[PDB]
Design an enzyme around this catalytic site. Sequence first.
Site, short mmCIF file in Angstrom:
data_model
loop_
_atom_site.label_atom_id
_atom_site.label_comp_id
_atom_site.label_asym_id
_atom_site.label_seq_id
_atom_site.Cartn_x
_atom_site.Cartn_y
_atom_site.Cartn_z
N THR B 10 -0.37 -20.35 10.47
CA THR B 10 -1.20 -20.66 9.32
C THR B 10 -1.96 -19.46 8.75
O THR B 10 -2.27 -18.31 9.57
CB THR B 10 -2.27 -21.68 9.75
OG1 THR B 10 -2.69 -21.68 10.98
CG2 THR B 10 -1.51 -23.06 9.98
N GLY B 11 -2.48 -19.65 7.55
CA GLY B 11 -3.33 -18.54 6.89
C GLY B 11 -2.29 -17.57 6.23
O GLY B 11 -1.17 -17.71 5.99
N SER B 39 -5.00 -26.48 13.41
CA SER B 39 -3.92 -26.76 12.49
C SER B 39 -2.79 -27.13 13.08
O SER B 39 -1.69 -27.56 12.31
CB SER B 39 -3.58 -25.24 12.29
OG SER B 39 -4.58 -24.35 11.82
N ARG B 98 -2.51 -1.15 20.88
CA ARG B 98 -1.72 -0.15 20.11
C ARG B 98 -2.00 1.33 20.97
O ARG B 98 -0.94 2.08 21.12
CB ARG B 98 -2.50 0.22 18.81
CG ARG B 98 -1.94 -0.76 17.79
CD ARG B 98 -2.17 -0.41 16.31
NE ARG B 98 -2.08 -1.50 15.28
CZ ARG B 98 -2.82 -1.86 14.31
NH1 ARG B 98 -3.76 -0.94 13.95
NH2 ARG B 98 -2.49 -2.96 13.42
N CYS B 127 -1.40 -0.29 8.70
CA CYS B 127 -0.69 -0.30 7.54
C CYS B 127 -0.83 1.09 6.75
O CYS B 127 0.37 1.66 6.43
CB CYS B 127 -1.33 -1.18 6.79
SG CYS B 127 -2.79 -1.73 6.49
N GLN B 154 -6.76 2.46 -0.81
CA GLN B 154 -6.40 1.28 -0.10
C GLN B 154 -6.43 0.08 -1.01
O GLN B 154 -7.76 -0.07 -1.45
CB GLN B 154 -6.67 1.48 1.17
CG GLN B 154 -6.00 2.29 2.21
CD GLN B 154 -6.56 2.33 3.80
OE1 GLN B 154 -6.74 3.44 4.09
NE2 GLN B 154 -6.48 1.12 4.54
N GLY B 158 -5.54 -5.63 2.52
CA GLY B 158 -5.70 -4.85 4.11
C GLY B 158 -6.61 -5.36 4.79
O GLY B 158 -6.67 -5.71 5.99
N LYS B 222 -7.65 5.61 13.53
CA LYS B 222 -6.46 4.98 13.76
C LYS B 222 -5.31 6.07 13.44
O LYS B 222 -4.38 6.35 14.12
CB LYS B 222 -6.29 3.65 13.10
CG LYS B 222 -6.91 2.61 14.01
CD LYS B 222 -6.66 1.34 13.44
CE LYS B 222 -7.52 -0.01 13.84
NZ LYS B 222 -7.05 -1.18 13.19
N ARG B 244 -11.33 2.23 -0.07
CA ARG B 244 -11.23 1.23 -0.62
C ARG B 244 -11.15 1.29 -2.38
O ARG B 244 -12.18 1.61 -2.71
CB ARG B 244 -11.87 -0.16 -0.41
CG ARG B 244 -11.16 -1.43 -0.42
CD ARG B 244 -10.00 -1.97 0.50
NE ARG B 244 -10.43 -2.28 1.87
CZ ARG B 244 -9.66 -2.40 2.92
NH1 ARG B 244 -8.51 -2.52 2.79
NH2 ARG B 244 -10.30 -2.73 4.10
N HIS B 251 -1.01 0.12 -0.90
CA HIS B 251 -1.84 1.29 -0.51
C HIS B 251 -1.17 2.39 -1.12
O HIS B 251 -0.04 2.50 -1.18
CB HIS B 251 -2.03 1.56 1.07
CG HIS B 251 -2.69 0.69 1.85
ND1 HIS B 251 -3.56 -0.25 1.10
CD2 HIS B 251 -2.81 0.17 3.15
CE1 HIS B 251 -4.07 -0.83 2.14
NE2 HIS B 251 -3.71 -0.75 3.36
#
Lengths: 358, 354
Positions: B10-11, B39, B98, B127, B154, B158, B222, B244, B251
């Site tokens: 969902t979403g 949900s 990560r 991303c 970006q 995102g 990151k 942004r 991006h």
Amino acid sequence: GYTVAVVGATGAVGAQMIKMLEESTLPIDKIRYLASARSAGKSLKFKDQDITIEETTETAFEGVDIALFSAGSSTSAKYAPYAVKAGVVVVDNTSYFRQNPDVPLVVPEVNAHALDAHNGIIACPNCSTIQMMVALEPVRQKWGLDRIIVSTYQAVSGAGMGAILETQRELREVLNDGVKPCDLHAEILPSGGDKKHYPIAFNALPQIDVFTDNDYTYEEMKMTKETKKIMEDDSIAVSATCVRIPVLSAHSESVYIETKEVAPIEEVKAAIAAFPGAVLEDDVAHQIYPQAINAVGSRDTFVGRIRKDLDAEKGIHMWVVSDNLLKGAAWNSVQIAETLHERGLVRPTAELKFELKL
Amino acid sequence: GYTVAVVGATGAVGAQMIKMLEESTLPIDKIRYLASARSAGKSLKFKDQDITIEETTETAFEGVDIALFSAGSSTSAKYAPYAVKAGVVVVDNTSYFRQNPDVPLVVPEVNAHALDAHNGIIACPNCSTIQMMVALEPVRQKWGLDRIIVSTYQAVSGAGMGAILETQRELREVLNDGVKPCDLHAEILPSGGDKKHYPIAFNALPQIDVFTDNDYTYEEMKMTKETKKIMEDDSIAVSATCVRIPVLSAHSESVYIETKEVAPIEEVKAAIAAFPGAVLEDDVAHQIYPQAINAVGSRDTFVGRIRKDLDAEKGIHMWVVSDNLLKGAAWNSVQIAETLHERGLVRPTAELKF
């Protein structure tokens, strides 16, 4: 006081120039507005007075002390040399005279000394160049500069009113009519004179001005060449990527430098904060940094996100924002005129060094 | 065939994960959708078949071969260790695993070999990082890579669906109701995890995620840390500025590199054009360069504006664009799953480490 002319008085560029002049400290005894034959006889305000527009001609500059050009390159190329012959000091807005060795290329807080040797024409630099010079000069004078890498986030107003209206139309079509960005029809951006045009709405266009033979655009090369001349140092390595984004007003710049000596960040911050025409907006604990929408309407150049490179000992990154229509254009031009007066340099030039066209 | 679970189905995030699976070359027997107990019970499409959304629990992963996570970090932290216990291979979308040494961090075109030693969890990278890796690997393998300086442009998606809606709201206010961008009210951007919020309309915000100790943001950090792990080289210098801009999808990145040996520009172009997942859009004579607008809906990473630095002999500048929802996220994950299959790595893990 002075007789001052505004050459290219009509239109959004002219109106910007008028506005800065109206707020100037310059002692003005007489104002004259010059534009094309179509505009002659029309009227525009200067402060509380209605000024009748005159046609720009070779003979139109008699008695003029200072002329602020605010039109295109063809107007400057044609009429500036005649202004000089008539005894005028010209402050030109275009790129036309910028690389001429007989013409100072001036940001008043940076290289006002270059004005002293003028030959009747002083060139205002490109808008993207100006703000970077204001931010970097205070760093250079204390720690030097070896190289600059810049990526720009430039406003559409830099391409004129047509570009701003194109941008608003395209955005309204997307958001109000449900048109897809890919289906938009563009007529001006990225570059009015070039062959193909692309939508700016929800886009980022890595082209400002047209391409040169080295695959950099004229905008990117102006940043390279104008920096070297303004800072009077051809050994400063400068490379630029100029990108148009959906912003109406104020350019933003991501700036990387390497200094000649190691510059303590706290000291770099303090040095920028103390430099005239620059404002430090850097307090990441409170999410304070320069923003385009906050800079619109201000003559100041705003610097933030100042930090060391993670690997290069002398590398520094920063964020630079300024209103491209004020300090990037009209205010820099008017500040040049005030600085010329400040230093006693408003005078006729004896030797004509610029050839007469026409 | 495989039983594939989409956790956080969902979403908006799960939505784009589904679309990529529908087109996958993966042999699927049964698709399962997992989400919140709020949900659970609802119906959601797979191709044309209606799927009953189940509750994500500690025992729900029985008989599942592959689980693609597309929820928050707290869902991954909690439920991924139970999926590995049940015998699933997990492909995580968040940042949570990560930097875990027991967890491969994979862009399939770049470091597919890192999958071989997985322990049940593979992490999808950030991303902004993914598209840069696809552009730069073909350069690195021929001429090496000493440093990277990148400034990003970006898209708001995102930051999630909420941010997209906020952006459209703000722009409509300016264009339709005459509000100065100055005076806009905002609740999400630049970050939902931070204290203050700023308008994005007609703006550029040099903040993505929150600030770390060293005055770089987590997003900038990151790009630094993920690059080193993906390319398996801690000596590569990487600094980033993450901005942004008012774009919804795709991006864009201004990327500067210095190689180890001099790389002829025509050859650099040829190598990128020949690299899987990369497309060369570079013909300045006809104004051809990557554009966010054109990248939307495509799995490809588009590279252009390729040129020599004016001074440094080993310096190269370029423009990199990719759909952040596809190759930046959902496609990269589904591609990881496809690679796991082609390499014979879809199998229960013996030594549980999570």
